[PDB]
Ligand SMILES: C[C@H](CCC(=O)O)[C@H]1CC[C@H]2[C@@H]3CC[C@@H]4C[C@H](O)CC[C@]4(C)[C@H]3C[C@H](O)[C@]12C
């Protein structure tokens with residue numbers, strides 16, 4: 255019974271470290287290919303861009319042909335594309351395979367989590383949702399620490415063998431444990447019908463504002479994940495110790511913000527938690543921007559600002575995700591996929607803008623772009639909350 259949700263969580267973990275272990279490893283990757291450091295954050299951009307490729311299709315598709323075969327195909331695709339990147343002959347082919355690997359991210363929410371809601375009761379589903387949320391918080395903390403430790407002893411190729419191996423364990427467990435729970439098995443799938451749905455959700459102004467706001471507000475965190483290898487190691491000329499150590503207060507604060515959210519949710523509305531989290535979000539981004547404009551190498555102030563920011567994200571984002579879902583009356587699969595794709599668009603484009611910001615203006619410009627993104631979230635929250 256519970257072997258199904260556990261293997262889905264193991265698969266979730268494997269795809270999350272698929273990003274988070276690789277980013278510190280990208281310094282070794284670009285050294286092996288003799289590619290520029292500008293390809294380091296583009297690894298994450300490709301991986302994210304893959305995750306918005308089939309996200310629209312898979313929910314409606316798996317409802318018609320079965321949750322089992324579609325989920326198993328996504329796990330097998332992840333394994334094959336993880337092993338396939340070892341044969342990449344240049345950084346362009348490497349980046350292409352990061353994109354193909356990224357398609358595997360679509361299957362977690364659209365196919366896997368849909369089957370969890372259909373299978374289990376409301377009480378058990380909430381416990382599984384919380385476990386998946388905890389794995390999402392642990393991955394970006396341990397990922398860079400483990401990735402940095404991995405690369406000093408073992409080659410980058412081994413990391414993809416690890417992700418494939420962890421995904422292969424979840425495949426066999428999902429093969430045995432996952433029940434078929436698709437409701438519309440046998441019915442026809444119309445692409446024009448899907449077109450009509452996704453055009454209709456985008457007409458909702460509050461839904462779009464909330465989804466866009468989630469993308470803008472989390473972009474500084476994702477930009478840090480993408481670039482912190484090249485910012486700290488290449489830019490500031492520091493070791494993996496400093497790199498790994500500076501992840502702790504940032505992602506520890508993100509966890510702390512979520513722990514505070516858990517203790518406050520019974521006596522706070524989602525509106526108040528957005529306003530309460532908004533103070534650390536804006537103050538954190540201001541401190542990081544102002545310090546690095548005053549002095550480009552003020553990386554401890556940057557880390558302090560990002561940690562205060564991350565605390566507010568942990569407090570505010572889950573509530574905004576809920577309000578954005580309530581803003582649209584259309585089906586949960588369409589609503590989840592649409593707001594997921596809107597965030598991914600902002601993350602992919604944002605990380606590339608962030609890359610060019612840092613390459614042209616150093617830490618100051620990196621943090622100033624992140625501040626603008628915080629202001630765009632804040633602007634949207636003024637409209638979104640009347
Ligand atoms: C926002 C979607 C959710 C899609 C959905 O289920 O509808 C999720 C799916 C996969 C998620 C990414 C997986 C890899 C990374 C893991 C880190 O721990 C945080 C940053 C990244 C880059 C994640 C950011 C974001 O949280 C994504 C893109």
Ligand SMILES: CCCCCCCCCO[C@@H]1O[C@H](CO)[C@@H](O)[C@H](O)[C@H]1O
Pocket residue numbers: 400403404405406407
């Ligand atoms: C999915 C989680 C995978 C965890 C695997 C991480 C292995 C990292 C090994 O690091 C190495 O450990 C040695 C001590 O054992 C040190 O001597 C060495 O300096 C260090 O580089």
Ligand SMILES: CCCCCCCC
Pocket residue numbers: 308319323324327328
């Ligand atoms: C029987 C499996 C069909 C393929 C499902 C995967 C869709 C991308």
Ligand SMILES: CCCCCCCC
Pocket residue numbers: 541544545548549552555
């Ligand atoms: C607002 C904080 C400014 C700190 C400047 C640091 C100078 C090295």
Ligand SMILES: CCCCCCCC
Pocket residue numbers: 554555558
């Ligand atoms: C060596 C400079 C110390 C800066 C400390 C800033 C912490 C908020």
Ligand SMILES: CCCCCC
Pocket residue numbers: 310445446448449452
């Ligand atoms: C969001 C793009 C969907 C297109 C379906 C034809």
Ligand SMILES: [Pr+3]
Pocket residue numbers: 447450
């Ligand atoms: Pr219709």
Ligand SMILES: [Pr+3]
Pocket residue numbers: 447451
């Ligand atoms: Pr429909």
